[PDB]
Amino acid sequence: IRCIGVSNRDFVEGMSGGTWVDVVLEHGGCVTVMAQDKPTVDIELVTTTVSNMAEVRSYCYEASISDMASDSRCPTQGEAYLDKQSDTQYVCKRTLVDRGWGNGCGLFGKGSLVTCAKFACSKKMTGKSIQPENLEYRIMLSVHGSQHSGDENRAKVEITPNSPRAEATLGGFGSLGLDCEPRTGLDFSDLYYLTMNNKHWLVHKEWFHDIPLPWHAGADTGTPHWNNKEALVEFKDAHAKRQTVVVLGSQEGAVHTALAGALEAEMDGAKGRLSSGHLKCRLKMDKLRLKGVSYSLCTAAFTFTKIPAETLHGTVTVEVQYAGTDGPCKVPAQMAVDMQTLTPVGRLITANPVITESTENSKMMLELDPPFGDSYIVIGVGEKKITHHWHRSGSTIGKAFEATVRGAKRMAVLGDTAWDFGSVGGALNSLGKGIHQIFGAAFKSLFGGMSWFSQILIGTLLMWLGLNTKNGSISLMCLALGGVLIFLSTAVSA
């Protein structure tokens, strides 16, 4: 449910003796989790809302110059004054006009004038900043069961950094009870919202503290005192004819152009809303229980409502009428390589498939993975039943192999803080985590500095080293790194 077909979706192995699991989830894809006849449930990131934001500095991406004037004092009259260099927002750059008799002065040479034109601003971009507090998630829940389109099996969980556990209660069976870790999110305390006009996107505290434009500090009451100003308002002159004070236009195309790595947000009335986090909330179980595990087997006709489906993530989804017999019964289904039915192979991704209630048709939609061959979905009546033929694709290592690239991107984007999908490695994961946490530092720093075409060439170059070197220490180097880089390139969105 709401997790079927969305792709981008890993399915977890199971509880494995802990009544507990480590699942990382993010705005897209879900994670369906099935363990030991506990109802199968899936949860998406949805929207991580940040509210209650400050303003750390500002930039004026536009400029309005005004008021000009000029100095014109002669040579060896010393300096020209013009009083505006006293007042605060009037930019001045002193230049030397080699000055002749036209102007009229005694000597000839550098004449020392500056036009001070009064700066002004319009439409500043605010650097609004956030901290882990006043953050939030609003995770959603699935629990296939039997539904289609709709509490019972969908419970939303607000999750804050100050209350990182979810008490999530479901009609008909027990709560899920997930315990989040919102405090290490996606390296926060480094994203500060950046507002230009009616659009918003995160940027770190390096691209954002590196901008040449004017500073402005915290707030705009009245009109602010603009730090810097040299970047806009560039004025110089030749032929020694006064001064040309240039506005330098607006920089929206520049800042838009200068931000290629910035996750775009959407923001309404504070409530700064986001999109692509990765959250650790680790599902606790043993509070989950199948609904109506008995219900006899429930028997009657079945008619496929819709021609069933095939997901891209190895699934077949089926809806069934059950032709109207009894109440809250239970109807089985099998994947049968043999005969119409017979032996059951493959696996039901949904568990305890059940009819809801009462009159005529109640549709039971069922996530099923056929075997790697081609079977015959079976609907469950001992005798009278409709069926199909599903021809799922591949050669073991066929799809299990691709698995080897999805896992690559699993901890390609997420990094090693993505080892957790796999639950309770304990003495073992530590090896996986301790390996790249020691490595996550170096690589994050050595080529942390690198971008996409950057790490392509550096990748190629190091590879070209790894082939021609001496014996030993660098005999294996490239495959230890250059491959890593050219992979992180082809990874991510790919």
Place this chain on the structure above:
Amino acid sequence: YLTMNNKHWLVHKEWFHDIPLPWHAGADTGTPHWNNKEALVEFKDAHAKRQTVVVLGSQEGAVHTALAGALEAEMDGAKGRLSSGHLKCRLKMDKLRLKGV
């Protein structure tokens, strides 16, 4: 000869044809037909579902940055005063007189 709002510039054809903007053909208006349009708008599809159309906003100033080293130029209706420049001339002194020698 290159116009913006008021300040006018001089630039290479080699530079001026290479600008990544939705060129126009400048023949006439009436219904300006914008070639490209792709460069200045960007379609950002959200990863989970759907697609957004997003402007790149005014690129104006960035074009000022790209003009580093132009010529500073002044215009009027029928000319556009051109500063800078250089001339070559053979100055013929044949006909002159010291006046009241």
Place this chain on the structure above:
Amino acid sequence: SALTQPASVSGSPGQSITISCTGTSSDVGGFNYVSWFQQHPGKAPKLMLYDVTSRPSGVSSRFSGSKSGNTASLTISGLQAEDEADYYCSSHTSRGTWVFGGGTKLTVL
């Protein structure tokens, strides 16, 4: 646009009726979006469809939907007689707008 739906019909109680709505590939064919909206004359319309075959819970299980190619068929049987509410078929087009069929005056004799 304007979903083709035929003007009106009738029959003995209990007898099957089928009102078929014919759209194009733009909407009814390339989508599972359908709705049949029982509109009691004088009152507000209501739901009697939801994603074709299925039904809202307060629906008389009488009703049955179906689709082939471009079609929408609301087939009713076991008529309780007092169930003529102008039937309008409506669907979500591909362009992101909804269109409501010409409607079927239902004739109860």
Place this chain on the structure above:
Amino acid sequence: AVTLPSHSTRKLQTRSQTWLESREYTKHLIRVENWIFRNPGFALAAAAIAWLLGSSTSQKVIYLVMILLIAPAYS
């Protein structure tokens, strides 16, 4: 102006698509190209220069890559 920072020297790695990831890379390459399309001469000079350092064959080519790449981008 001369806004220096290119946020891609940092970016952020996440499931969802970043701002101009596509427009970005193709762009980096298409900049270099119609740089060199307008100055084949510098391909000559860069050629002779690079082939004059290193004596070792291939790095020669590494010098050509370094020089062809730095001329248009920074400078």
Place this chain on the structure above:
Amino acid sequence: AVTLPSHSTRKLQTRSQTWLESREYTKHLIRVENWIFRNPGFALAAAAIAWLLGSSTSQKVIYLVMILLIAPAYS
């Protein structure tokens, strides 16, 4: 957007003041510097890489100049 051409690849040579000749030539340099002040690590990696090519001493330093200048600008 991301207008590629920087007119200085041609400029024009005249006694008169070009547009942004001053803030030009430097904003090149000051772009490289913070870019380097924000990624000392890449100075380490670039160091080891360069010093592994050419064996010739001063060729090495050319490689580090090669690479330190290529990273911030030309991606």
